[PDB]
Design a protein around this ligand. Structure first.
Ligand SMILES: [Fe+3]
Length: 53
């Protein structure tokens, strides 16, 4: 699946990995993340991510 980079801190949201520690199961598409989801490293909002394609 897709990978999205947090432009603030360089954290890669990997859809394949999800973000379980923050309520996100593997295979969760970035667009399907709750609007309140933020980068688990720097706290940047979704808006600060860019899809790596
Ligand atoms: Fe970040």
């Amino acid at each position: 699946m897709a990978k999205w980079v947090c432009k603030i801190c360089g954290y890669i949201y990997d859809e394949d990995a999800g973000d379980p520690d923050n309520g996100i199961s593997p295979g969760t598409k970035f667009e399907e993340l709750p609007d309140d989801w933020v980068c688990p490293i720097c706290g940047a909002p979704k808006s600060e991510f860019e899809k790596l394609e």
